[PDB]
Amino acid sequence: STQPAQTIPWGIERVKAPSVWSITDGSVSVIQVAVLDTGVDYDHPDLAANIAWCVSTLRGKVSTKLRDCADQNGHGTHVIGTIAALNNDIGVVGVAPGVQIYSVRVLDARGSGSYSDIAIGIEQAILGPDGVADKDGDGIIAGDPDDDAAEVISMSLGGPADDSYLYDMIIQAYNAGIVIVAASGNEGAPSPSYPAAYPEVIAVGAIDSNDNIASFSNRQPEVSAPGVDILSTYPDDSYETLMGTAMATPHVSGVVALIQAAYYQKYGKILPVGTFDDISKNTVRGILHITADDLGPTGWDADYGYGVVRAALAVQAALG
Amino acid sequence: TIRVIVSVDKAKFNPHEVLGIGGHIVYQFKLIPAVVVDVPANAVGKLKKMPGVEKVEFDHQAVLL
Ligand SMILES: [Ca+2]
Ligand SMILES: [Ca+2]
Ligand SMILES: [Ca+2]
Ligand SMILES: [Ca+2]
Ligand SMILES: [Ca+2]
Ligand SMILES: [Ca+2]
Ligand SMILES: [Ca+2]
Ligand SMILES: [Zn+2]
């Protein structure tokens, strides 16, 4: 079937991505976004050019075979398209439509995943294709052009358990300089699921096209983003509309990719990750917080977090 | 068997330690001092007391959101 003519989904517009693309579409050589999910439809015409690495960690076995890394569910393909669908004549367009993606398959065809597989996936995003975290020994991993580590790890998934080996891996990612982004969860709970709940991870809640928080969105997130009626890529070489904090997550990861790409383009370095409390323009998370559209009551609140991410303003903050 | 994840002091642990209790090694992490192991459910308490073992944790589940 003939591909449909390109449209910009409402959520891409909401997070103020299109005005950034004249500065960068995310296609800065050193920047990769690792999406830990159900895999990817790696030949999708609106994704293929941005799929830089395709791997699987299912059952505790690292595989780089296309057959093993391919998406048997659809969710990963959707998430990836929100971040990085190509700006061209077909389909949709991602927040960062030129960013390299590492698709790391940690969830099976059912969309279920073991924590062990997820932790292996995070390890793989740090190690990159070359199997080595920090080749030159300088302590610089994310943002080091000699290494192939991802700069963003995006986890549109969650569970109730807090395990120390998993947290240890999250800590390794953080110390590598990797911004970690995760869905808050879809149970209408008072706080985010794991790994979103870790201090080193940006928890993302979901808003609808009326700027209301989705009723399912777990509360006390760090930021929020479009997560209801989200059109994106879907297998096979097609498109689908979904809801969930899994759909909000990639919008944030895309914004981070734009920030880091723009910052590297200008300065030849990346910004530090930052912390939940940061309200400066000196870290990624600080920039996300200060530029977010503060919905609901003034200030951080349990529904929106700091607010709805806005790529245009974030990138200006980064480059200012 | 069940699948668990063992945290260790790498300098005080050798993965062969777990074989005598029916364990087998699934994955040795490169970036954290831990190993994913398949073992008899009855042997979990045994792992906890092995040289270099700091913690044994169950393999939990996450789902797509
Ligand atoms: Ca395909
Ligand atoms: Ca497109
Ligand atoms: Ca590497
Ligand atoms: Ca390095
Ligand atoms: Ca270096
Ligand atoms: Ca990189
Ligand atoms: Ca607010
Ligand atoms: Zn086994």
Side-chain angles (χ1 to χ4, degrees), chain A residues 16 41 46 50 60 87 94 105 131 133 138 157 160 164 174 184 189 191 222 227 232 235 253 262 282-283 297:
Chain A
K16 305 305 176 180
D41 173 8
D46 218 24
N50 288 340
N87 188 1
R105 180 177 190 205
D138 52 20
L157 60 84
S164 63
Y174 183 77
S184 68
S191 51
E222 181 163 343
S232 191
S253 301
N282 292 312
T283 68

mmCIF file with all atom_site columns, all heavy atoms in Angstrom, chain A residues 16 41 46 50 60 87 94 105 131 133 138 157 160 164 174 184 189 191 222 227 232 235 253 262 282-283 297:
data_model
loop_
_atom_site.group_PDB
_atom_site.id
_atom_site.type_symbol
_atom_site.label_atom_id
_atom_site.label_alt_id
_atom_site.label_comp_id
_atom_site.label_asym_id
_atom_site.label_entity_id
_atom_site.label_seq_id
_atom_site.pdbx_PDB_ins_code
_atom_site.Cartn_x
_atom_site.Cartn_y
_atom_site.Cartn_z
_atom_site.occupancy
_atom_site.B_iso_or_equiv
_atom_site.pdbx_formal_charge
_atom_site.auth_seq_id
_atom_site.auth_comp_id
_atom_site.auth_asym_id
_atom_site.auth_atom_id
_atom_site.pdbx_PDB_model_num
ATOM 1   N N   . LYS A 1 16  ? 6.187  21.860  20.780 1.00 0.00 ? 16  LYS A N   1
ATOM 2   C CA  . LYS A 1 16  ? 6.951  22.955  20.165 1.00 0.00 ? 16  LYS A CA  1
ATOM 3   C C   . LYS A 1 16  ? 8.247  22.441  19.512 1.00 0.00 ? 16  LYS A C   1
ATOM 4   O O   . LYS A 1 16  ? 9.308  23.054  19.665 1.00 0.00 ? 16  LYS A O   1
ATOM 5   C CB  . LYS A 1 16  ? 7.230  24.051  21.210 1.00 0.00 ? 16  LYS A CB  1
ATOM 6   C CG  . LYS A 1 16  ? 5.944  24.579  21.896 1.00 0.00 ? 16  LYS A CG  1
ATOM 7   C CD  . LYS A 1 16  ? 4.857  25.091  20.906 1.00 0.00 ? 16  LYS A CD  1
ATOM 8   C CE  . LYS A 1 16  ? 3.535  25.528  21.618 1.00 0.00 ? 16  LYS A CE  1
ATOM 9   N NZ  . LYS A 1 16  ? 2.462  26.027  20.706 1.00 0.00 ? 16  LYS A NZ  1
ATOM 10  N N   . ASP A 1 41  ? 10.132 -2.012  13.718 1.00 0.00 ? 41  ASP A N   1
ATOM 11  C CA  . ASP A 1 41  ? 9.885  -2.392  12.311 1.00 0.00 ? 41  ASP A CA  1
ATOM 12  C C   . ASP A 1 41  ? 10.984 -1.669  11.561 1.00 0.00 ? 41  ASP A C   1
ATOM 13  O O   . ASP A 1 41  ? 10.848 -0.522  11.118 1.00 0.00 ? 41  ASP A O   1
ATOM 14  C CB  . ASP A 1 41  ? 8.490  -1.911  11.950 1.00 0.00 ? 41  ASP A CB  1
ATOM 15  C CG  . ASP A 1 41  ? 8.165  -2.081  10.496 1.00 0.00 ? 41  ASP A CG  1
ATOM 16  O OD1 . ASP A 1 41  ? 8.903  -2.707  9.709  1.00 0.00 ? 41  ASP A OD1 1
ATOM 17  O OD2 . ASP A 1 41  ? 7.019  -1.764  10.155 1.00 0.00 ? 41  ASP A OD2 1
ATOM 18  N N   . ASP A 1 46  ? 9.262  5.246   7.065  1.00 0.00 ? 46  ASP A N   1
ATOM 19  C CA  . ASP A 1 46  ? 9.371  6.489   7.805  1.00 0.00 ? 46  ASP A CA  1
ATOM 20  C C   . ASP A 1 46  ? 10.303 6.388   9.029  1.00 0.00 ? 46  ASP A C   1
ATOM 21  O O   . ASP A 1 46  ? 10.464 7.408   9.726  1.00 0.00 ? 46  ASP A O   1
ATOM 22  C CB  . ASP A 1 46  ? 7.996  6.984   8.190  1.00 0.00 ? 46  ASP A CB  1
ATOM 23  C CG  . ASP A 1 46  ? 7.875  8.482   8.094  1.00 0.00 ? 46  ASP A CG  1
ATOM 24  O OD1 . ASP A 1 46  ? 8.652  9.142   7.329  1.00 0.00 ? 46  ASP A OD1 1
ATOM 25  O OD2 . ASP A 1 46  ? 6.998  9.097   8.759  1.00 0.00 ? 46  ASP A OD2 1
ATOM 26  N N   . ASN A 1 50  ? 16.907 6.220   10.286 1.00 0.00 ? 50  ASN A N   1
ATOM 27  C CA  . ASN A 1 50  ? 17.362 6.606   11.590 1.00 0.00 ? 50  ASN A CA  1
ATOM 28  C C   . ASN A 1 50  ? 17.640 5.441   12.532 1.00 0.00 ? 50  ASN A C   1
ATOM 29  O O   . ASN A 1 50  ? 17.971 5.672   13.696 1.00 0.00 ? 50  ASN A O   1
ATOM 30  C CB  . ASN A 1 50  ? 16.316 7.543   12.253 1.00 0.00 ? 50  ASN A CB  1
ATOM 31  C CG  . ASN A 1 50  ? 16.291 8.935   11.618 1.00 0.00 ? 50  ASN A CG  1
ATOM 32  O OD1 . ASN A 1 50  ? 17.253 9.364   10.948 1.00 0.00 ? 50  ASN A OD1 1
ATOM 33  N ND2 . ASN A 1 50  ? 15.154 9.653   11.785 1.00 0.00 ? 50  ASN A ND2 1
ATOM 34  N N   . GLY A 1 60  ? 17.825 -12.932 28.283 1.00 0.00 ? 60  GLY A N   1
ATOM 35  C CA  . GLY A 1 60  ? 19.159 -12.804 28.858 1.00 0.00 ? 60  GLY A CA  1
ATOM 36  C C   . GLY A 1 60  ? 20.258 -13.071 27.869 1.00 0.00 ? 60  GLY A C   1
ATOM 37  O O   . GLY A 1 60  ? 21.404 -13.262 28.259 1.00 0.00 ? 60  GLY A O   1
ATOM 38  N N   . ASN A 1 87  ? 11.274 13.489  8.566  1.00 0.00 ? 87  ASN A N   1
ATOM 39  C CA  . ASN A 1 87  ? 10.621 14.667  7.979  1.00 0.00 ? 87  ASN A CA  1
ATOM 40  C C   . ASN A 1 87  ? 10.845 14.515  6.483  1.00 0.00 ? 87  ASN A C   1
ATOM 41  O O   . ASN A 1 87  ? 11.935 14.724  5.968  1.00 0.00 ? 87  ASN A O   1
ATOM 42  C CB  . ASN A 1 87  ? 11.197 15.906  8.577  1.00 0.00 ? 87  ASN A CB  1
ATOM 43  C CG  . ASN A 1 87  ? 10.423 17.129  8.162  1.00 0.00 ? 87  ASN A CG  1
ATOM 44  O OD1 . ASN A 1 87  ? 9.431  16.988  7.423  1.00 0.00 ? 87  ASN A OD1 1
ATOM 45  N ND2 . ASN A 1 87  ? 10.851 18.313  8.600  1.00 0.00 ? 87  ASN A ND2 1
ATOM 46  N N   . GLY A 1 94  ? 8.826  12.863  13.677 1.00 0.00 ? 94  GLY A N   1
ATOM 47  C CA  . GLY A 1 94  ? 9.203  12.822  15.078 1.00 0.00 ? 94  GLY A CA  1
ATOM 48  C C   . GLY A 1 94  ? 9.638  14.159  15.658 1.00 0.00 ? 94  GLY A C   1
ATOM 49  O O   . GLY A 1 94  ? 9.864  15.130  14.922 1.00 0.00 ? 94  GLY A O   1
ATOM 50  N N   . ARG A 1 105 ? 15.484 -4.254  22.158 1.00 0.00 ? 105 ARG A N   1
ATOM 51  C CA  . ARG A 1 105 ? 14.269 -5.020  22.420 1.00 0.00 ? 105 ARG A CA  1
ATOM 52  C C   . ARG A 1 105 ? 14.368 -5.742  23.790 1.00 0.00 ? 105 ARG A C   1
ATOM 53  O O   . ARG A 1 105 ? 15.126 -6.690  23.961 1.00 0.00 ? 105 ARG A O   1
ATOM 54  C CB  . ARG A 1 105 ? 14.007 -6.009  21.322 1.00 0.00 ? 105 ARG A CB  1
ATOM 55  C CG  . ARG A 1 105 ? 12.793 -6.819  21.526 1.00 0.00 ? 105 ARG A CG  1
ATOM 56  C CD  . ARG A 1 105 ? 12.478 -7.765  20.397 1.00 0.00 ? 105 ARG A CD  1
ATOM 57  N NE  . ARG A 1 105 ? 11.172 -8.349  20.567 1.00 0.00 ? 105 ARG A NE  1
ATOM 58  C CZ  . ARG A 1 105 ? 10.821 -9.515  20.057 1.00 0.00 ? 105 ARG A CZ  1
ATOM 59  N NH1 . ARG A 1 105 ? 11.703 -10.226 19.396 1.00 0.00 ? 105 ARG A NH1 1
ATOM 60  N NH2 . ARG A 1 105 ? 9.597  -9.976  20.232 1.00 0.00 ? 105 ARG A NH2 1
ATOM 61  N N   . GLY A 1 131 ? 30.625 -2.771  22.317 1.00 0.00 ? 131 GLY A N   1
ATOM 62  C CA  . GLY A 1 131 ? 30.768 -3.552  23.524 1.00 0.00 ? 131 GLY A CA  1
ATOM 63  C C   . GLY A 1 131 ? 31.590 -3.020  24.645 1.00 0.00 ? 131 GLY A C   1
ATOM 64  O O   . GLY A 1 131 ? 31.836 -3.727  25.635 1.00 0.00 ? 131 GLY A O   1
ATOM 65  N N   . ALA A 1 133 ? 32.098 0.442   27.199 1.00 0.00 ? 133 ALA A N   1
ATOM 66  C CA  . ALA A 1 133 ? 31.523 1.696   27.653 1.00 0.00 ? 133 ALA A CA  1
ATOM 67  C C   . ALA A 1 133 ? 32.350 2.932   27.295 1.00 0.00 ? 133 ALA A C   1
ATOM 68  O O   . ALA A 1 133 ? 31.873 3.875   26.658 1.00 0.00 ? 133 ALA A O   1
ATOM 69  C CB  . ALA A 1 133 ? 31.298 1.666   29.105 1.00 0.00 ? 133 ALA A CB  1
ATOM 70  N N   . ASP A 1 138 ? 38.600 8.067   29.445 1.00 0.00 ? 138 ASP A N   1
ATOM 71  C CA  . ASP A 1 138 ? 38.544 9.408   29.997 1.00 0.00 ? 138 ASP A CA  1
ATOM 72  C C   . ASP A 1 138 ? 37.393 9.730   30.936 1.00 0.00 ? 138 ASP A C   1
ATOM 73  O O   . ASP A 1 138 ? 37.290 10.850  31.433 1.00 0.00 ? 138 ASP A O   1
ATOM 74  C CB  . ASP A 1 138 ? 38.652 10.508  28.926 1.00 0.00 ? 138 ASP A CB  1
ATOM 75  C CG  . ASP A 1 138 ? 37.674 10.357  27.790 1.00 0.00 ? 138 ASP A CG  1
ATOM 76  O OD1 . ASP A 1 138 ? 36.629 9.636   27.967 1.00 0.00 ? 138 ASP A OD1 1
ATOM 77  O OD2 . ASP A 1 138 ? 37.869 10.916  26.673 1.00 0.00 ? 138 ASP A OD2 1
ATOM 78  N N   . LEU A 1 157 ? 7.819  1.877   29.767 1.00 0.00 ? 157 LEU A N   1
ATOM 79  C CA  . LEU A 1 157 ? 7.464  0.630   30.431 1.00 0.00 ? 157 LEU A CA  1
ATOM 80  C C   . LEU A 1 157 ? 7.634  0.831   31.915 1.00 0.00 ? 157 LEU A C   1
ATOM 81  O O   . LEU A 1 157 ? 8.308  1.785   32.352 1.00 0.00 ? 157 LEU A O   1
ATOM 82  C CB  . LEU A 1 157 ? 8.414  -0.474  29.886 1.00 0.00 ? 157 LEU A CB  1
ATOM 83  C CG  . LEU A 1 157 ? 9.906  -0.244  30.107 1.00 0.00 ? 157 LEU A CG  1
ATOM 84  C CD1 . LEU A 1 157 ? 10.344 -0.693  31.472 1.00 0.00 ? 157 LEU A CD1 1
ATOM 85  C CD2 . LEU A 1 157 ? 10.768 -0.945  29.018 1.00 0.00 ? 157 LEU A CD2 1
ATOM 86  N N   . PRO A 1 160 ? 6.361  -2.571  39.385 1.00 0.00 ? 160 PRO A N   1
ATOM 87  C CA  . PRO A 1 160 ? 6.229  -2.140  40.782 1.00 0.00 ? 160 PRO A CA  1
ATOM 88  C C   . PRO A 1 160 ? 7.426  -2.312  41.644 1.00 0.00 ? 160 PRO A C   1
ATOM 89  O O   . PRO A 1 160 ? 7.505  -1.685  42.712 1.00 0.00 ? 160 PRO A O   1
ATOM 90  C CB  . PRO A 1 160 ? 5.091  -3.010  41.290 1.00 0.00 ? 160 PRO A CB  1
ATOM 91  C CG  . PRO A 1 160 ? 5.168  -4.264  40.503 1.00 0.00 ? 160 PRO A CG  1
ATOM 92  C CD  . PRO A 1 160 ? 5.638  -3.832  39.104 1.00 0.00 ? 160 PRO A CD  1
ATOM 93  N N   . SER A 1 164 ? 17.808 -3.570  43.615 1.00 0.00 ? 164 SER A N   1
ATOM 94  C CA  . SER A 1 164 ? 19.081 -2.883  43.628 1.00 0.00 ? 164 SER A CA  1
ATOM 95  C C   . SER A 1 164 ? 19.998 -3.089  42.438 1.00 0.00 ? 164 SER A C   1
ATOM 96  O O   . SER A 1 164 ? 20.686 -2.143  42.055 1.00 0.00 ? 164 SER A O   1
ATOM 97  C CB  . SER A 1 164 ? 19.790 -3.080  44.955 1.00 0.00 ? 164 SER A CB  1
ATOM 98  O OG  . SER A 1 164 ? 20.083 -4.413  45.155 1.00 0.00 ? 164 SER A OG  1
ATOM 99  N N   . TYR A 1 174 ? 23.433 6.960   34.469 1.00 0.00 ? 174 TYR A N   1
ATOM 100 C CA  . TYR A 1 174 ? 23.477 8.352   34.881 1.00 0.00 ? 174 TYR A CA  1
ATOM 101 C C   . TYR A 1 174 ? 24.909 8.888   34.877 1.00 0.00 ? 174 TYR A C   1
ATOM 102 O O   . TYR A 1 174 ? 25.186 9.954   34.369 1.00 0.00 ? 174 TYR A O   1
ATOM 103 C CB  . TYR A 1 174 ? 22.881 8.443   36.253 1.00 0.00 ? 174 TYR A CB  1
ATOM 104 C CG  . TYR A 1 174 ? 22.785 9.844   36.789 1.00 0.00 ? 174 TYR A CG  1
ATOM 105 C CD1 . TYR A 1 174 ? 21.794 10.712  36.353 1.00 0.00 ? 174 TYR A CD1 1
ATOM 106 C CD2 . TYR A 1 174 ? 23.689 10.302  37.727 1.00 0.00 ? 174 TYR A CD2 1
ATOM 107 C CE1 . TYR A 1 174 ? 21.684 12.005  36.872 1.00 0.00 ? 174 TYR A CE1 1
ATOM 108 C CE2 . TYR A 1 174 ? 23.609 11.611  38.241 1.00 0.00 ? 174 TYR A CE2 1
ATOM 109 C CZ  . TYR A 1 174 ? 22.607 12.453  37.798 1.00 0.00 ? 174 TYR A CZ  1
ATOM 110 O OH  . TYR A 1 174 ? 22.521 13.737  38.321 1.00 0.00 ? 174 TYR A OH  1
ATOM 111 N N   . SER A 1 184 ? 5.472  7.356   33.546 1.00 0.00 ? 184 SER A N   1
ATOM 112 C CA  . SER A 1 184 ? 5.112  7.302   34.965 1.00 0.00 ? 184 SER A CA  1
ATOM 113 C C   . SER A 1 184 ? 4.252  6.107   35.288 1.00 0.00 ? 184 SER A C   1
ATOM 114 O O   . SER A 1 184 ? 4.240  5.655   36.427 1.00 0.00 ? 184 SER A O   1
ATOM 115 C CB  . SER A 1 184 ? 4.399  8.572   35.426 1.00 0.00 ? 184 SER A CB  1
ATOM 116 O OG  . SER A 1 184 ? 3.119  8.692   34.841 1.00 0.00 ? 184 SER A OG  1
ATOM 117 N N   . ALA A 1 189 ? -2.097 5.861   39.704 1.00 0.00 ? 189 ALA A N   1
ATOM 118 C CA  . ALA A 1 189 ? -1.481 5.762   41.008 1.00 0.00 ? 189 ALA A CA  1
ATOM 119 C C   . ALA A 1 189 ? -0.949 7.065   41.532 1.00 0.00 ? 189 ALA A C   1
ATOM 120 O O   . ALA A 1 189 ? -0.786 8.042   40.801 1.00 0.00 ? 189 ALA A O   1
ATOM 121 C CB  . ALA A 1 189 ? -0.386 4.760   40.931 1.00 0.00 ? 189 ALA A CB  1
ATOM 122 N N   . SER A 1 191 ? 2.009  7.810   42.588 1.00 0.00 ? 191 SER A N   1
ATOM 123 C CA  . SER A 1 191 ? 3.385  8.053   42.280 1.00 0.00 ? 191 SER A CA  1
ATOM 124 C C   . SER A 1 191 ? 3.765  7.158   41.096 1.00 0.00 ? 191 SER A C   1
ATOM 125 O O   . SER A 1 191 ? 3.007  6.325   40.682 1.00 0.00 ? 191 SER A O   1
ATOM 126 C CB  . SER A 1 191 ? 4.271  7.785   43.484 1.00 0.00 ? 191 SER A CB  1
ATOM 127 O OG  . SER A 1 191 ? 3.999  6.503   44.018 1.00 0.00 ? 191 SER A OG  1
ATOM 128 N N   . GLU A 1 222 ? 7.710  14.099  36.806 1.00 0.00 ? 222 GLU A N   1
ATOM 129 C CA  . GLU A 1 222 ? 8.621  15.213  36.697 1.00 0.00 ? 222 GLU A CA  1
ATOM 130 C C   . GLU A 1 222 ? 8.161  16.209  35.614 1.00 0.00 ? 222 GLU A C   1
ATOM 131 O O   . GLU A 1 222 ? 8.206  17.430  35.833 1.00 0.00 ? 222 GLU A O   1
ATOM 132 C CB  . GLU A 1 222 ? 10.016 14.686  36.415 1.00 0.00 ? 222 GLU A CB  1
ATOM 133 C CG  . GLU A 1 222 ? 11.094 15.758  36.293 1.00 0.00 ? 222 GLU A CG  1
ATOM 134 C CD  . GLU A 1 222 ? 12.490 15.211  36.418 1.00 0.00 ? 222 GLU A CD  1
ATOM 135 O OE1 . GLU A 1 222 ? 12.612 14.079  36.914 1.00 0.00 ? 222 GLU A OE1 1
ATOM 136 O OE2 . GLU A 1 222 ? 13.443 15.866  35.978 1.00 0.00 ? 222 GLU A OE2 1
ATOM 137 N N   . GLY A 1 227 ? -0.058 12.247  25.422 1.00 0.00 ? 227 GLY A N   1
ATOM 138 C CA  . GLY A 1 227 ? -0.166 10.831  25.641 1.00 0.00 ? 227 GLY A CA  1
ATOM 139 C C   . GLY A 1 227 ? -1.510 10.205  25.383 1.00 0.00 ? 227 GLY A C   1
ATOM 140 O O   . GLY A 1 227 ? -1.763 9.101   25.823 1.00 0.00 ? 227 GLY A O   1
ATOM 141 N N   . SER A 1 232 ? 1.320  7.532   15.363 1.00 0.00 ? 232 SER A N   1
ATOM 142 C CA  . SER A 1 232 ? 2.732  7.295   15.047 1.00 0.00 ? 232 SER A CA  1
ATOM 143 C C   . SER A 1 232 ? 2.893  6.116   14.117 1.00 0.00 ? 232 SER A C   1
ATOM 144 O O   . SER A 1 232 ? 1.917  5.514   13.701 1.00 0.00 ? 232 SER A O   1
ATOM 145 C CB  . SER A 1 232 ? 3.507  7.108   16.353 1.00 0.00 ? 232 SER A CB  1
ATOM 146 O OG  . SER A 1 232 ? 4.890  7.133   16.068 1.00 0.00 ? 232 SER A OG  1
ATOM 147 N N   . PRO A 1 235 ? 3.745  -1.344  12.883 1.00 0.00 ? 235 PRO A N   1
ATOM 148 C CA  . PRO A 1 235 ? 3.969  -2.388  11.867 1.00 0.00 ? 235 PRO A CA  1
ATOM 149 C C   . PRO A 1 235 ? 2.659  -2.723  11.166 1.00 0.00 ? 235 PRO A C   1
ATOM 150 O O   . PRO A 1 235 ? 1.587  -2.577  11.744 1.00 0.00 ? 235 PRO A O   1
ATOM 151 C CB  . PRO A 1 235 ? 4.455  -3.594  12.679 1.00 0.00 ? 235 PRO A CB  1
ATOM 152 C CG  . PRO A 1 235 ? 4.865  -3.006  14.018 1.00 0.00 ? 235 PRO A CG  1
ATOM 153 C CD  . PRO A 1 235 ? 3.905  -1.880  14.247 1.00 0.00 ? 235 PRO A CD  1
ATOM 154 N N   . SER A 1 253 ? 11.853 12.388  25.441 1.00 0.00 ? 253 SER A N   1
ATOM 155 C CA  . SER A 1 253 ? 13.123 11.922  24.966 1.00 0.00 ? 253 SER A CA  1
ATOM 156 C C   . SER A 1 253 ? 13.570 12.672  23.709 1.00 0.00 ? 253 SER A C   1
ATOM 157 O O   . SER A 1 253 ? 14.754 12.940  23.523 1.00 0.00 ? 253 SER A O   1
ATOM 158 C CB  . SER A 1 253 ? 13.079 10.423  24.742 1.00 0.00 ? 253 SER A CB  1
ATOM 159 O OG  . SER A 1 253 ? 12.753 9.764   25.952 1.00 0.00 ? 253 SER A OG  1
ATOM 160 N N   . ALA A 1 262 ? 21.702 20.170  19.867 1.00 0.00 ? 262 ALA A N   1
ATOM 161 C CA  . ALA A 1 262 ? 21.926 21.583  19.641 1.00 0.00 ? 262 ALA A CA  1
ATOM 162 C C   . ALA A 1 262 ? 23.117 22.043  20.445 1.00 0.00 ? 262 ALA A C   1
ATOM 163 O O   . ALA A 1 262 ? 23.938 22.841  19.972 1.00 0.00 ? 262 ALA A O   1
ATOM 164 C CB  . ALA A 1 262 ? 20.664 22.365  19.998 1.00 0.00 ? 262 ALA A CB  1
ATOM 165 N N   . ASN A 1 282 ? 21.478 25.138  33.469 1.00 0.00 ? 282 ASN A N   1
ATOM 166 C CA  . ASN A 1 282 ? 22.786 24.528  33.366 1.00 0.00 ? 282 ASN A CA  1
ATOM 167 C C   . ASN A 1 282 ? 22.782 23.005  33.210 1.00 0.00 ? 282 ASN A C   1
ATOM 168 O O   . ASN A 1 282 ? 23.841 22.389  33.175 1.00 0.00 ? 282 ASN A O   1
ATOM 169 C CB  . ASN A 1 282 ? 23.554 24.911  34.620 1.00 0.00 ? 282 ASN A CB  1
ATOM 170 C CG  . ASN A 1 282 ? 23.877 26.393  34.642 1.00 0.00 ? 282 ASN A CG  1
ATOM 171 O OD1 . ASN A 1 282 ? 24.377 26.925  33.633 1.00 0.00 ? 282 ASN A OD1 1
ATOM 172 N ND2 . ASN A 1 282 ? 23.548 27.075  35.738 1.00 0.00 ? 282 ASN A ND2 1
ATOM 173 N N   . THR A 1 283 ? 21.597 22.408  33.258 1.00 0.00 ? 283 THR A N   1
ATOM 174 C CA  . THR A 1 283 ? 21.499 20.956  33.051 1.00 0.00 ? 283 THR A CA  1
ATOM 175 C C   . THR A 1 283 ? 20.304 20.674  32.198 1.00 0.00 ? 283 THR A C   1
ATOM 176 O O   . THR A 1 283 ? 19.407 21.497  32.072 1.00 0.00 ? 283 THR A O   1
ATOM 177 C CB  . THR A 1 283 ? 21.367 20.150  34.331 1.00 0.00 ? 283 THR A CB  1
ATOM 178 O OG1 . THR A 1 283 ? 20.096 20.424  34.948 1.00 0.00 ? 283 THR A OG1 1
ATOM 179 C CG2 . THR A 1 283 ? 22.429 20.551  35.330 1.00 0.00 ? 283 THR A CG2 1
ATOM 180 N N   . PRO A 1 297 ? -2.230 24.189  38.746 1.00 0.00 ? 297 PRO A N   1
ATOM 181 C CA  . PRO A 1 297 ? -1.782 25.159  39.728 1.00 0.00 ? 297 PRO A CA  1
ATOM 182 C C   . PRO A 1 297 ? -0.395 25.590  39.448 1.00 0.00 ? 297 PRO A C   1
ATOM 183 O O   . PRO A 1 297 ? 0.407  24.812  38.917 1.00 0.00 ? 297 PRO A O   1
ATOM 184 C CB  . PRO A 1 297 ? -1.782 24.380  41.030 1.00 0.00 ? 297 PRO A CB  1
ATOM 185 C CG  . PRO A 1 297 ? -2.745 23.313  40.850 1.00 0.00 ? 297 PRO A CG  1
ATOM 186 C CD  . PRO A 1 297 ? -2.716 22.954  39.378 1.00 0.00 ? 297 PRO A CD  1
#
